[PDB]
Ligand binder design. Structure first.
Ligand code: SRM
Ligand code: SF4
Ligand code: CL
Ligand code: CL
Ligand code: K
Length: 538
C-alpha cells in the first residue's frame, strides 16, 4: 500500500465533512447526493421546517427535493416507503442498549395511532423501535415530541453509525460480565452529538454497526458488528478487546476479526472515534457493495488499518489485545423469556414474546401500563424482537401472570416462537421479494402443531438478500425469493439456510436448499427439525 493511499479523502468545511475535490472521481450516486447537499442540514439548520411544507407531488418534481425525502431524510431517521406505502415514512430511533421508558412508549403509540391503518410499530434486529405511517408535514412536530420525551432519531439510516447494541440483561443479570448501558449510552451520545447531530461521523462511506458485550451468552452478536467491544482484563485493568469489520450483505458475509487492540474502559469513545475517522477518511466510495469497513481492512491489511486507528488515538497509543477476554467459552445461551430473578434481591424481570416484533398503538399502551404497574416504567427491547420488563417486585409476579395481555405477549410461548425473527418484508419494504412477518408466523404455527421439541431452534426470515433478519445466524434461515410451482406459475419462496451458530462458538450458515415454494416449507421444516434437532412428531 502506497503512502498516497493514506491521504484523508474528506475535509471539514463549515461544520460538515465533505469529500475533497480531488477524491470525487468514480463515486457512487449516494456520494453525489451527499455532495449536492449536506443531509445533516435538514436537522442542524432546520431545513426540515421548509421542506415539510412542500406538497409531496411537488417535491417529486425536482431531483434536489426528491433526494431530500428519499435519501437525506434517513440522516433524521426517516425512510420514505416510496414503492409500498407512498407518501408515508418509517421512522427509526437511536435506542442504545434497547432501553425505553413507558412515557416514551406512550408517545410513540400516540404518533402511530394518528395514522390508523397506515400506522404500527416494530422492534428491530438491533433492539430498536421503528414507527410507521408518518406524513412529511407532521415531521417537525414529531421531532419536537421525540426530543421532549428524551428520544432521538438521528443518524439511524444510510451512511451512519447504527443503533449501539448491548446486553438486554445489563444491570439485572446475576451472571453479567459488565453493565453495557453506560458504554452504549456514551456511544450514542458521541454518535449523535448529544442529540444535536455529529457531522464528524455522519459522512461515512457506508453504514456501520457497533455493539458492546456484557454477557457470556453474547446476546450482542459481536461476530457480526463493524466494531465489537469484548470485555477483557489486561495487565490488571478492566477494558475491551476490539473486533472489527463484521458485516452482512447480498454479496458477502464476514465475521468480525481481531484488531489486535485492547483499550481501557474509559477509552471506549476515543477508539470508536479513531476507527470511524479512519473509515471516513480512507474508505472506498465506489461500488456500494464494496464500501463496508471490512473492504478497507482487506485493502490495507488488518495491521495497516490498525496503524490508521493508532495515529488517531489520543497520544497515539493503542495497546495490543489481551491474550484472553472475560467471556467464558463454557456457556449455554440462556432463555430470557419468562420470569427470572435479578441480582437485586426481591426483584425479577420478565421476558415477553412479541410475535414477529409487530405491535399496534393499543399494544404499546398496554405494555407501557404493565411496565408502570409492575416494573419501574422501563421496557427493554431485544434483537430477537421481544421485550423484557425489568425491576418487578417478585411478590407481584403471580398477579402479572394473570394479566390478559400476556395471552398475546406471552412469557412462555411455544419454543419455536421464542426463537423466531423476521424482517419487515414487503408489507412496507420496497426491496422485499416476499411477505415475511405474517407468513413466518403462519408457517411456524403449522410446524409447531406437527412436532414437539426441546432444543431452542432459532428460525430467521428475511425478505431479500440484504439479510436484515440475519439468516446466516439462524439454525434454519429463510431468504425470500420468487420461484415456481409444479405448473410453472410464479410463487413466493425461500432459499433455506442451515449451519448458523451464535455465542462464542459462532458460525455463519449457508444456503442448504434453493427456491422452495413457501407453500411447501412446512413439510421440509418439520422433517429438518425431526432429523437434525431432535423434534418428535405429535
Ligand atoms: C428494520 C430492520 C429489520 C427488522 O425487521 O428488524 C431493517 C430494515 C431495513 N434495512 Fe436493514 N434492517 C435492520 C437491520 C439490518 C441488519 C442486522 C444487524 O444490524 O445486525 C443487517 C445485516 C447486518 C449488516 O448490516 O452488516 C441489515 C442489512 C441491510 C442492508 C445491506 C447492507 C450492505 O452492506 O449491503 C441494507 C441495504 C443498504 O444499506 O444498502 C438494509 C436496508 C434496510 C432498509 C432501511 C431498506 C429500506 O429503506 O427500505 C429496511 C427498512 C424496511 C422497513 O421499512 O422497516 N439493511 N439491516 C433492522 C433495523 C435495525 C435498526 O434498528 O437499526
Ligand atoms: S432483508 Fe430486505 S426485505 Fe427485509 S427489511 Fe431488509 S431490505 Fe427489506
Ligand atoms: Cl438506509
Ligand atoms: Cl421504496
Ligand atoms: K419476537
Amino acid at each position: 500500500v502506497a503512502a498516497e493511499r493514506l491521504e484523508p479523502r474528506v475535509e471539514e468545511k463549515d461544520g460538515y465533512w465533505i469529500l475533497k475535490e480531488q477524491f470525487r472521481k468514480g463515486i457512487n450516486p449516494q456520494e453525489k447526493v451527499k455532495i449536492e447537499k449536506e443531509p445533516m442540514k435538514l436537522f442542524m439548520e432546520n431545513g426540515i421546517e421548509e421542506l415539510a411544507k412542500i406538497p409531496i407531488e411537488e417535491i417529486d418534481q425536482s431531483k434536489l427535493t426528491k433526494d431530500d425525502i428519499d435519501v437525506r431524510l434517513k440522516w433524521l431517521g426517516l425512510f420514505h416507503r416510496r414503492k409500498n406505502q407512498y407518501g408515508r415514512f418509517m421512522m427509526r430511533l437511536k435506542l442504545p442498549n434497547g432501553v425505553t421508558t413507558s412515557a416514551q412508549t406512550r408517545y410513540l403509540a400516540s404518533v402511530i395511532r394518528k395514522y390508523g391503518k397506515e400506522g404500527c410499530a416494530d422492534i428491530t434486529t438491533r433492539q430498536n423501535w421503528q414507527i410507521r405511517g408518518v406524513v412529511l408535514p407532521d415531521v417537525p412536530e414529531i421531532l419536537k415530541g421525540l426530543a421532549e420525551v428524551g428520544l432521538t432519531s438521528l443518524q439511524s439510516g444510510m451512511d451512519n453509525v447504527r443503533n449501539p447494541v448491548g446486553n438486554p440483561l445489563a444491570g439485572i443479570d446475576p451472571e453479567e460480565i459488565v453493565d453495557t448501558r453506560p458504554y452504549t449510552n456514551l456511544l450514542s451520545q458521541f454518535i449523535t452529538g448529544n442529540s444535536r447531530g455529529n457531522p464528524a461521523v455522519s459522512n461515512l462511506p457506508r453504514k456501520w454497526n457497533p455493539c458492546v458485550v456484557g454477557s457470556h451468552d453474547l446476546y450482542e452478536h459481536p461476530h457480526i458488528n463493524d466494531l465489537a467491544y469484548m470485555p477483557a482484563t489486561k495487565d490488571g485493568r478492566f477494558g475491551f478487546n476490539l473486533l472489527v469489520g463484521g458485516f452482512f450483505s447480498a454479496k458477502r458475509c464476514d465475521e468480525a476479526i481481531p484488531l489486535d487492540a485492547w483499550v481501557p474502559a474509559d477509552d471506549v469513545v476515543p477508539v470508536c472515534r479513531a476507527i470511524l475517522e479512519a473509515f471516513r477518511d480512507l474508505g472506498f466510495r465506489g461500488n456500494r457493495q464494496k464500501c463496508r469497513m471490512m473492504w478497507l481492512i482487506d485493502e490495507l491489511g488488518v495491521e495497516g488499518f490498525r496503524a490508521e486507528v493508532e495515529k488517531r488515538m489520543p497520544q497515539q497509543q493503542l495497546e495490543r489485545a489481551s491474550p484472553e477476554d472475560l467471556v467464558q467459552k463454557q456457556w449455554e445461551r440462556r432463555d430470557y423469556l419468562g420470569v427470572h430473578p435479578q441480582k437485586q434481591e426481591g426483584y425479577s424481570f420478565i421476558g415477553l414474546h412479541i410475535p414477529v416484533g409487530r405491535v399496534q398503538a393499543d399494544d404499546m399502551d398496554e405494555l407501557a401500563r404493565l411496565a408502570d404497574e409492575y416494573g419501574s416504567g422501563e421496557i427493554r427491547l431485544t434483537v430477537e424482537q421481544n421485550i423484557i420488563i425489568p425491576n418487578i417486585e417478585t411478590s407481584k409476579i403471580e398477579a402479572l401472570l394473570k394479566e390478559p395481555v400476556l395471552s398475546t405477549f406471552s412469557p412462555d410461548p411455544p419454543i419455536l416462537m421464542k426463537g423466531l425473527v423476521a424482517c419487515t418484508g414487503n408489507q412496507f419494504c420496497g426491496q422485499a421479494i416476499i411477505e415475511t412477518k405474517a407468513r413466518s408466523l403462519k408457517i411456524t404455527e403449522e410446524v409447531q402443531r406437527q412436532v414437539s421439541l426441546t432444543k431452542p431452534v432459532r428460525m430467521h426470515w428475511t425478505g431479500c438478500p440484504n439479510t436484515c433478519a440475519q439468516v446466516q445466524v439462524a439454525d434454519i434461515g429463510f431468504m425470500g425469493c420468487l420461484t415456481r410451482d409444479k405448473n410453472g406459475k410464479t410463487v413466493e419462496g425461500a432459499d433455506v439456510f442451515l449451519g448458523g451458530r451464535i455465542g462464542s462458538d459462532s458460525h455463519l450458515g449457508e444456503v442448504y436448499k434453493k427456491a422452495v415454494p413457501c407453500d411447501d416449507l412446512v413439510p421440509l421444516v418439520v422433517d429438518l427439525l425431526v432429523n437434525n434437532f431432535g423434534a418428535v412428531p405429535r
